Swiss-Prot record:
It comes from Methanocaldococcus jannaschii (strain ATCC 43067 / DSM 2661 / JAL-1 / JCM 10045 / NBRC 100440). Residues 1-85 form the Glutaredoxin domain. The keyword Lipid metabolism does not apply. This is Thioredoxin. Belongs to the glutaredoxin family. The keyword Disulfide bond applies. The lineage of its organism: Archaea, Methanobacteriati, Methanobacteriota, Methanomada group, Methanococci. InterPro entries: GLR_AS, Thio_glut, Thioredoxin-like_fold, Thioredoxin-like_sf, Thioredoxin_domain. It is found in: Cytoplasm. One of its GO terms (biological process) is cell redox homeostasis. The gene is trx.
Length: 85
């Protein structure tokens, strides 16, 4: 009971991925209101996500769970929050 929290903790620099733009559009398809997106381009901000158990960019939160899946952002799970988050 906090709305669907997404966070985007990375500054991808080789592949200019849509990053938070995909993750927001994808979950806003599901929940066009119960959505929170921290797009935190990794620069000038604390490692508060880059701590955790993952300690490996691209550091991504979907619903509230902290993870990283691929060279791009959480696309493997984005294929499933689209399905039944």
């Amino acid at each position: 009971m906090s709305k669907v929290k997404i966070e985007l903790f990375t500054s991808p620099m080789c592949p200019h991925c849509p990053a938070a733009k995909r993750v927001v559009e994808e979950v806003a398809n599901e929940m066009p209101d119960a959505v929170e997106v921290e797009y935190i381009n990794v620069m000038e901000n604390p490692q508060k996500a880059m701590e955790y158990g993952i300690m490996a960019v691209p550091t991504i939160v979907i619903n509230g769970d902290v993870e990283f899946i691929g060279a791009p952002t959480k696309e493997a799970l984005v294929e499933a929050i689209k399905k039944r988050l």
